[PDB]
């Protein structure tokens, strides 16, 4: 069912700072020539929208897109089925979705001059990076190579154009400033649950160590593992014996211990191999990355935590990609999120 | 006043093309290093969202943000009151809002290399332009100089930071490709009404000349005037006797004539001077720009059209800025839009 009843909805900007050009602004002089002269720029702010059901129950959910994405991935699937935003408003949660700084409706810090440069200061790099359709295909485990699908895939096949159109570049904004914006959002809304994805997995972990209002984390296929400083376990290279996964993020142990105080669940889809796969770099990357996360959750649990790893195939769901929340079975994926929230009372007032 | 009941909601991507890097993609090689080799890139696609009421009436509305903006400006005001999206779903219209190519969730075409460059080809310029807080303050007629308000202003004071944070740069995407994406949307949705703003004013006029499904246009303070080719009337410079307004866009008369076949209203706010104001460049710019538009509407009416200029002060609304649909009296502004829709039969099935 697609019907949704909202007590209220809206959007707002939060976070960011200002930077300034030289000189003074003269309102009698041509303004459209557009210079940095006397200019104030708001940079690195974050876009937030919310939908609140009638009679909400439990804590609000904050959905945080993965790398190169926007809040669109929580609104609808590529083939136009309801996303988690609709599903969880229907589940009587207030739902926030964000476009983080540097992505979508979040700020891209650029000015009058080469991209990212304000006179002689480099706010973000002029040289960009961006994934390709082919890179994203294998990153997301649609299949082992572009154009190919794993058997019993849950990808909405035929909607590849819609799917890859949602992805884009990110400028070199400091991860510190992205975490800061979401910490400010968590302060603004009160106790809440973070639901993260891929690149925003490690960032949401960082937010929780700065914000007691984060009462729970569910992370869909986080990309970067996190460990106490100096206590990164041995992690093997990839099957090509030269490549490695993302360098794990290290935080002071006093902050790492805060992750032991809240329920945390990492969710993984299908077709992550058990054994080395030299022929398919990103399948092997996911094998080792998932292994690193299992060690990260173990370290949290050794400090008193409540951290768990959910492989969707163990729960009877086969064929999920790196985006289980937009796959064809995303209602069943949502049902498992509801189960986690209910188990820990995060769906009660 | 905030409750909304939706039969369905969602978002999707539409329009755009692809460009390709050199070489071929090999899934056995490191994918994350990140390069253009073997790369297909989707570029210039547009983001679209929709909210459909239960029991819709009349034609769907397409809200099209002004320059440097996004669909946020139709969602909420900077002080958090409902935007036109909520107001017109409550008025039982299906409401589409877009982030055009190059803005917000629309695509920004950049790759692996200097911003906008795909190997040797410049897709968009590496040098950007962007307005400042100061330039936007006087552009939007909050007051005559940055930090100063007109006594009558309808701006939601105290929420300046929120307001200016919604603005950003646009890469040098061809206007043809922006018009193309919206023509494809209008083809997809069927008969509809365009509601435009500032920079999207001239673009919406162009869409209507390509798309018979556009059945009406309301433009809030369009920034660029439009005339039949070779029939641009005499337009004076600004009071400084050096500056000019935006060069009017010229189209073939066979296309311009299609503007005479639908109702068209341009809406202007307050504090546009009647006499030359050499001390306040953007106040004077709005005086001459509004004059040019009056001549543009006259040309449409001389081709049998029904094109009107609504000055909000003549309807009893004083103090409106360049964003009347987010001002403190935006409910009264919406009432005037509903009047236009009802008079022209655009709110009946
Ligand atoms: C349109 O709907 C909402 C919802 C919401 O919360 C669920 N907050 C706003 N705005 C809002 O709070 N602005 S604000 O006041 O300027 C502000 C502060 C502050 O000063 O207390 C801190 N952050 N910010 C953004 N709009």
Author numbering:
A (entry chain A), B (entry chain B): 12 to 360
Would you copy out the relevant sentences from the publication that reported this structure?
SulE, an esterase, which detoxifies a variety of sulfonylurea herbicides through de-esterification, provides an attractive approach to remove environmental sulfonylurea herbicides and develop herbicide-tolerant crops. SulE catalyzes the de-esterification of a variety of sulfonylurea herbicides, such as MM, BM, SM, TM, TrM, EM, and CE, to the corresponding herbicidal-inactive parent acid. The structures show that SulE is a dimer with a lid loop in a domain-swapped β-hairpin covering the active site from the opposing monomer. SulE shows a similar catalytic triad consisting of Ser209, His333, and Glu232 at its active site.
Structural analysis showed that Pro44 is located in the lid loop. In addition, the B factors of the residues in this loop region is much higher in P44R mutant than in the wildtype, suggesting that the mutation of Pro44 to arginine makes this loop region more flexible. Structural comparison analysis shows that the P44R mutation leads to lid loop shift, which in turn modulates substrate binding and enzyme activity. Structural analysis indicated that the substitution of Pro44 with arginine altered the flexibility of the lid loop, and further allowed the relocation of the heterocycle ring of MM and CE.
